[PDB]
Amino acid sequence: SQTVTIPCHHIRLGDILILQGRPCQVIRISTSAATGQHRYLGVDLFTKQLHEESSFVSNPAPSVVVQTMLGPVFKQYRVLDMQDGSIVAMTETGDVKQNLPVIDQSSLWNRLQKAFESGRGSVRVLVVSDHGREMAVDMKVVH
């Protein structure tokens, strides 16, 4: 309910994966000489520390070999207000989050503020959770 399984051949630099239980932005992908597993080096979205984790290899059916990692399930919240590096957000069911932080990554705050001031009702934030802690890590505009 918190994670989604992603095939390694669909993982690129910049993707967000769960590494050592933490949501992280991938900054390096390499291959283990001994096992053929892929190794992902990432930056923890919350603490900014580096973490690495290698892929899980499975053989679920004859001649089917799968290598996967976990990615987080992103939630999408409406944006009701913006106040000093945090936002007031609303869930799909109307639950209000008063002080939701916004990651300082790829000018997200500035892009969010421009989109919010053009049309407030169509702006959404994509939100990751880390052990009760929520943060807005990207944005979308609904059509």
Residue numbers in the entry: 30 to 172
Study text:
Here, we present InCellCryst, an advanced pipeline for producing homogeneous microcrystals directly within living insect cells. We have demonstrated the pipeline on five different proteins (IMPDH, HEX-1, Cathepsin B, Luciferase and EGFP-µNS), representing a selection of soluble proteins of different source organisms that crystallize in insect cells in their native compartment or, in case of peroxisomes, readily in the cytoplasm or nucleus of the cells. Importantly, as shown for IMPDH and HEX-1, InCellCryst can produce crystals from native protein sequences, without purification tags or even remnants of proteolytically removed tags, within a quasi-native cellular environment. The rich source of biomolecules in the cellular environment allows the identification of native ligands by co-crystallization at quasi physiological conditions, representing a unique feature of InCellCryst.
The N- and C-terminal addition of single amino acids (cyto) leads to spindle-like crystals in the cytosol. The disruption of the native PTS1 signal by cloning into the pFB1 cyto and cyto v2 vectors transformed the hexagonal crystal blocks into a spindle-like shape. Whereas HEX-1 cyto and cyto v2 both formed spindle-like as well as bipyramidal crystals, HEX-1 ori crystals exhibit a hexagonal block shape. For HEX-1 ori and HEX-1 cyto crystals diffracted at 100 K one distinct unit cell population was found, whereas two unit cell populations were identified for HEX-1 cyto v2. For data collection from intact crystal-containing cells at 100 K, we carefully transferred the cells onto a MicroMesh mounted on a light microscope stage. Serial diffraction datasets of the crystals contained in viable cells was performed using a helical grid scan approach, available at the EMBL P14 beamline located at the PETRA III storage ring (DESY, Hamburg, Germany). CrystFEL is optimized for still images in high multiplicity collected at RT at XFEL sources and thus, can be directly applied to serial synchrotron data. All HEX-1 structures show an increased flexibility between Phe145 and Ser151, the C-terminal loop region after the α-helix.
